[PDB]
């Protein structure tokens, strides 16, 4: 919940004045604000190149398995991780 | 640029124009249309390219008054463009014989309109709505007449003189929303009563609505205002600014309401006093329509 309020400064600016002007609590902040986007806004980090990866990446795992002696470690899945995510 | 077409819809309620004579007015129907005629000619006086469209609303019909149907223009159909090789009416012109080319054809046809006092169709009053599209098809053909470096600036005049009739409310509203597609200005001068519905039609257009100050005093505002181009009004800084318009009631009992609710999928928004569907015999799904009756 805390990475949500730090990576987004606009909602943090919203979240400031409930602590600054002491409007509500954090317990009340996550009780009536979010409640729907727990499935919607959290649908980014779970999917990530279609999780439960069966037939999406498997087409491209063999052609993108090698660029060079060190062509690896792109981002998160880059070119090594979903190999581990099947076996 | 362009050709600058005009459209004019005149109210001719012979019930009311008879009632215009019942007060023994200092402004009659004879005094009415002649102004409107030269008003139509005033359009023509800005440019040779200018063209007109004039129809009234008879109780049984709306015949094209301008330009003509009868054997004086059924074989003539105007001189400029696609000529009939017709000599006499094709001869005399230039700001004064064009009008008597069209003066005749209105007074002969309102004669054909004012010979049909034999109404038995249960006060079939002002039939504006179907009369509107009679222009709109014709100018669509006139759009297809020539467009090649020829922008059709059409402009619609509506003239009201009497009350509206009991016509179909949908078929009232739709053509304006179709005129909303059509991108043509519609302007309205009324004489006797106000039409909240037709001034909403003005609001759809962003045209102009006018209550007359006085029926014999309908020659100077008609000069200034109901006068063309959207150039003369987007530049002429004089707009009737008033357009007070509250609306939005419902249909079961009678109201004036800020909260509606539909009765079925059929777009039937009714008053709250409504147990069972009067839009159909299909019953309402029992989760929602008593929540209109719950809080």
């Amino acid at each position: 919940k805390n990475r949500m309020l730090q990576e987004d400064p606009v909602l943090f600016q919203l979240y400031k004045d409930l602590v600054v002007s002491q409007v509500i609590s954090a317990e009340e902040f996550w009780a009536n604000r979010l409640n729907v986007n727990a499935t919607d806004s959290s649908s980014t980090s779970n999917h990530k190149q279609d999780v439960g990866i069966s037939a999406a990446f498997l087409a491209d795992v063999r052609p993108q398995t090698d660029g060079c002696n060190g062509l690896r470690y792109n981002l998160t899945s880059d070119i090594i991780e979903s190999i581990f995510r099947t076996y | 640029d362009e050709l600058n077409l005009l459209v004019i819809v005149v109210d001719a309620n012979p019930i009311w124009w008879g009632k215009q004579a019942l007060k023994e007015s200092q402004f009659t129907l004879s005094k009415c249309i002649d102004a409107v005629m030269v008003l139509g000619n005033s359009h023509l006086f800005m440019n040779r390219s200018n063209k007109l469209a004039v129809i009234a609303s008879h109780i049984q019909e709306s015949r094209f008054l301008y330009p003509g149907k009868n054997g004086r223009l059924g074989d003539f159909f105007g001189d400029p463009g696609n000529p009939p090789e017709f000599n006499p009416s094709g001869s005399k012109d230039g700001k004064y014989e064009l009008l008597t080319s069209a003066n005749e054809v209105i007074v002969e046809e309102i004669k054909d309109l004012m010979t049909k006092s034999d109404i038995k169709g249960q006060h079939t009053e002002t039939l504006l709505a179907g009369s509107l599209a009679k222009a709109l098809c014709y100018i669509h053909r006139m759009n297809k007449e020539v467009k090649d470096n020829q922008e059709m600036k059409s402009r619609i005049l509506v003239i009201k003189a009497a009350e509206d009739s009991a016509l179909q409310y949908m078929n009232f509203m739709n053509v304006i929303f179709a005129a909303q597609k059509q991108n043509i200005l519609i302007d309205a001068c009324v004489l006797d009563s106000d039409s909240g519905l037709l001034q909403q039609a003005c609001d759809i257009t962003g045209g102009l609505y006018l209550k007359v100050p006085q029926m014999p005093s309908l020659l100077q505002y008609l000069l200034w205002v109901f006068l063309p181009d959207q150039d003369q009004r987007s530049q002429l800084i004089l707009p009737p600014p008033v357009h007070v318009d509250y609306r939005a009631a419902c249909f079961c009992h009678r109201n004036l309401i800020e909260i509606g609710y539909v009765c079925s999928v059929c777009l039937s928004i009714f008053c709250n006093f409504s147990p069972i569907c009067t839009t159909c015999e299909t019953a309402f799904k029992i989760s929602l329509p008593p929540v209109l009756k719950a809080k």
Binding site: L14 | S30, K31, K111, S117, A249
Partner: protein, 150 residues
């Protein structure tokens, strides 16, 4: 037969109640009642007589030659033109404190108010079902009480 059945009854209701809205009904029948001896047709007789009367009056256009020269009715027609040509005394400079009265409320209070509307919409929502006494949860009936003072 699903929207066939709607059409048979709603246009029937659009027939028996054709536009019972604001101006749409009340001016309508009132002037139809003003037509009066129209089944008696004595007004319609005079109408059809006046249909027959000014029948000839339009076409001659000698009466409708000079249905123009009334400069008596030009001045008044020039008048409400000139009257509406100059409205006056209505605070021409209406703003010019609005920049101070923007940046001070649109620094916190745009977002502060938004703190309410993220909540107050739900505050409308639990009461939008509460007399049915179904969505009656302790999580909600004191959430009525919670943010109320907050």
């Amino acid at each position: 037969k699903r929207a066939k059945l709607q059409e048979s009854i709603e246009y029937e209701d659009l027939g028996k109640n054709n536009s019972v809205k604001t101006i749409a009904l009340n001016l309508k029948k009132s002037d139809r009642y003003y037509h009066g001896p129209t089944p008696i047709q004595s007004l319609q007789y005079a109408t059809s007589q006046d249909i027959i009367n000014s029948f000839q009056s339009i076409r001659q256009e000698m009466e409708a030659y000079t249905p123009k020269l009334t400069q008596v009715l030009s001045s008044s027609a020039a008048s409400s033109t000139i009257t509406a040509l100059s409205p006056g005394g209505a605070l021409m400079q209406g703003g010019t404190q609005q920049a101070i009265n923007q940046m001070v409320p649109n620094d916190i209070q745009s977002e502060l108010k938004h703190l309410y509307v993220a909540v107050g919409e739900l505050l409308r929502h639990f009461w939008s079902c509460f007399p049915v006494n179904t969505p009656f949860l302790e999580e909600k009936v004191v959430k009525m009480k919670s943010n109320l003072e907050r």
